[PDB]
């Protein structure tokens, strides 16, 4: 049982020309990297406050 | 006469956990963008224009102060 990752074909109509052409000009996939980064800013990080707290240990 | 405790799944079973690929849209069309942008454009010459008109008139005030000036 197996599936292919890079076996797709791109649809060929005007819109889709159009909006790739977008892409390619407007660059939205990079302002969508953008997005994840701010994103990534706004939430609260994984820091501890290391030698005040400790990382978890086990018996 | 304990009976066995052991590590082991709840009752039924644990809920179903996401492993598919999961990547929306999250995007305008085309057509509307290059219409935003050409739109922008556009509102912007128009502003500059008369924005430049009025310096070039301004300029011949100045200049025709130098001439009255000059001799």
Same mark, same amino acid.
């Given at each position: 049982? &197996? +599936?292919?990752?890079?076996?797709? =074909? %791109? $649809?060929?109509? *005007? +819109? $889709?020309?159009?909006?790739?052409?977008?892409?390619?000009?407007?660059?939205? =996939?990079?302002?969508?990297?953008?997005? *994840?980064? !701010? $994103? &990534? !800013?706004?939430? =609260? %990080?994984?820091?501890?406050? &290391? %030698?005040? =707290? +400790?990382?978890?240990? $086990? %018996? | 006469?304990?009976?066995?405790?052991?590590?082991?799944?709840?009752?039924? #079973?644990? #809920?179903? /956990?996401?492993?598919?690929?999961?990547?929306?849209?999250? #995007?305008?069309? #085309?057509?509307?963008?290059?219409?935003?942008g050409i739109g922008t454009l556009l509102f912007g010459y128009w502003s500059m224009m008369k924005w430049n008109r009025e310096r070039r008139r301004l300029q011949i005030?100045?200049?025709?102060?130098? /001439?009255?000036?000059?001799?």
């Open positions: 049982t &197996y +599936k292919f990752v890079n076996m797709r =074909e %791109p $649809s060929m109509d *005007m +819109k $889709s020309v159009t909006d790739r052409a977008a892409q390619t000009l407007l660059w939205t =996939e990079l302002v969508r990297g953008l997005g *994840m980064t !701010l $994103s &990534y !800013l706004f939430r =609260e %990080p994984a820091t501890i406050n &290391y %030698p005040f =707290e +400790k990382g978890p240990l $086990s %018996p | 006469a304990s009976k066995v405790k052991q590590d082991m799944p709840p009752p039924g #079973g644990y #809920g179903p /956990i996401d492993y598919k690929r999961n990547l929306p849209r999250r #995007g305008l069309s #085309g057509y509307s963008m290059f219409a935003v005030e100045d200049f025709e102060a130098r /001439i009255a000036l000059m001799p």
